[PDB]
């Protein structure tokens, strides 16, 4: 929080906490199936799935094959998107809406057209 902002450092620590919980739960998910988790543990995994997907990006190296342009996401837009996404403000969207997407305005564009 000395080099990056306090907001950046908080958001990145929450994203790591969620992905650490999901990495611990993936054993239960594989062995017992999702139904073995509580309502709160499945409420976490529903977010964690969408967070790990939203770390994927349509990038200028993929423009060779998909033909769709590679996206740049500003640092402030990245922080503000993961701050909303970790608080769960996008829990109602399907996981497919978050694959290979170029920031929050583009998330809305994909989700409304899916």
């Amino acid at each position: 929080p000395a080099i990056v902002g306090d907001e950046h450092y908080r958001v990145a620590q929450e994203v790591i906490r969620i992905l650490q919980r999901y990495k611990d739960l993936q054993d239960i998910i594989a062995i017992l199936g999702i139904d073995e988790l509580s309502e709160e543990d499945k409420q976490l995994v529903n977010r964690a799935r969408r967070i790990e997907r939203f770390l994927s990006q349509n990038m200028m190296a993929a423009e060779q094959f998909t033909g769709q342009p590679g996206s740049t996401v500003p640092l402030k837009e990245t922080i503000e998107a993961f701050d909303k996404l970790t608080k769960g403000e996008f829990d109602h969207l399907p996981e497919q809406a978050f694959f290979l997407i170029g920031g929050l305005d583009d998330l809305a564009k994909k989700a409304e057209s899916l």
Binding site: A30, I31, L32, G33
Partner: protein, 91 residues
């Protein structure tokens, strides 16, 4: 005796015919899932049915990859051998 899942080829799919890619692409995933699940071989009744069907599949794929010496299979024959496994006809 090939220890798959530490053994690797950096050339990858470019060295396979299309029939071998379509048939065997899932094979590494099924053997990595079986290599996780083998610790539950003692609890096959308690294990969830979705992964019980990965454990018995993995055991039948590991049998499928065994081969006597001086018996090399032509690609036309091992495409069909891997097909028996990954498409579940061995199940």
């Amino acid at each position: 005796a090939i220890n798959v899942g530490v053994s690797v080829s950096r050339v990858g799919g470019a060295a396979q015919i299309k029939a071998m890619k379509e048939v065997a692409g899932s094979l590494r995933l099924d053997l990595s899932q079986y290599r996780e699940l083998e610790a539950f071989a003692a609890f096959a009744s308690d294990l969830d049915a979705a992964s019980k069907a990965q454990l018995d599949r993995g055991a039948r794929l590991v049998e499928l990859l065994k081969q006597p010496q001086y018996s090399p299979l032509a690609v036309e024959e091992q495409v069909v051998a891997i097909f028996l496994g990954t498409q579940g006809h061995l199940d």
